[PDB]
């Protein structure tokens, strides 16, 4: 998160910190969010050979009783995820066991309604990602308030599509999701409407988020079958 504030500790109890293993490089990291006691939503580009989820974290360098470190038993990457266009950048992770509900850990289920969210309003995103181009991932959970933009603001992303994705962050400010915030929720009036996907390497906003409303049928189909 660039240009944000430190979250109040444990104030976003659905937030998940993902450690991503690959066979041919060191660990990588993403965010995500708990939508059922045994399911985390994140970005498809966060897939790996194996993943471990930490729930209940604030400072990810300091072990505490709120932590739950949980094994992922299976990854459900969207079957149409495209590494060229980056369309359909969404994935569900099934946890080996259901998480414990505490003050610091809880779900964020979708409401019944799945209305298309138009441009104009302010929403908020949280993550442990980099705080600038030359800066390392934050030890503490950070968050920032960003403007939903008209889709023409994201035209320069030549594979951007308004039906599939949200355009997020006023270009006149530095405030943005960035590298390492991958997979985190964009909440608009307390409802998850987006998932951090991608942006510019130089961190100039806006960035591109997956539009959750488009994928609600797919999300439901995985949950009901598993």
For position 201 contacting ligand A1AOO by CB under 6 A, the verdict is yes
Write the interaction track for Zn ion spanning residues 62-91; mark x where CB under 5 A is met and - where it is not. Answer: --x-x-------------------------
Active site annotation includes 87 = no
Q: How many residues touch ligand A1AOO (CB under 6 A)?
A: 13
Whether the Cβ atoms of residue 89 and residue 79 lie closer than 8 Å to each other: no
Active site annotation includes 45 = yes
Active site annotation includes 112 = no
The catalytic position among 88, 89, 138, 197 is 89
Of 70-78, 131-139, 152-160, 196-204: span binding ligand A1AOO (CB under 6 A): 196-204
User: Which residue, 10, 3, 41, is CA-closest to 192?
Assistant: 41
Q: How far is CA 200 from the centre of its chain?
A: 17
For 81-114, letters b (16+ CB in 10 Å) and e give: beeeebbbbbbbbbbeeebeeeebbbbbebeeeb
Whether the Cβ atoms of residue 166 and residue 199 lie closer than 8 Å to each other: no
Of 52-60, 74-82, 166-174, 176-184: span binding ligand A1AOO (CB under 6 A): 176-184
Residues marked active site are found at: 45, 89, 182
């Amino acid at each position: 998160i660039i240009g944000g504030t430190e979250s109040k500790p444990h104030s976003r109890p659905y937030m998940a910190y993902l450690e991503i293993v690959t066979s041919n490089g060191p660990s990588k990291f993403c965010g995500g969010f708990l939508i059922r006691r045994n399911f985390v939503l994140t970005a498809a580009h966060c897939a790996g050979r194996s993943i471990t989820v930490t729930l209940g974290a604030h400072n990810i360098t300091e072990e505490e009783d709120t932590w739950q470190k949980l094994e992922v038993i299976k990854q459900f990457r969207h079957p149409k995820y495209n590494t060229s266009t980056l369309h359909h950048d969404i994935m569900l992770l099934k946890l080996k066991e259901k998480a414990s509900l505490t003050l610091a850990v809880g779900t964020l289920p979708f409401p019944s309604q799945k209305n298309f969210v138009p441009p104009g309003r302010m929403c908020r995103v949280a993550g442990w990602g980099r705080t600038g181009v030359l800066k390392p991932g934050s030890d503490t959970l950070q968050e920032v308030k960003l403007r939903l933009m008209d889709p023409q603001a994201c035209s320069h992303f030549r594979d951007f599509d308004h039906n599939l994705q949200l355009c997020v962050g006023n270009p006149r400010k530095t405030k943005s999701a960035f590298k390492g915030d991958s997979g985190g929720p964009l909440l608009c009036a307390g409802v998850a409407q987006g998932i951090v996907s991608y942006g510019r390497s130089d961190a100039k906003p806006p960035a591109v988020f997956t539009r959750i409303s488009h994928y609600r049928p797919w999300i439901n189909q995985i949950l009901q079958a598993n």
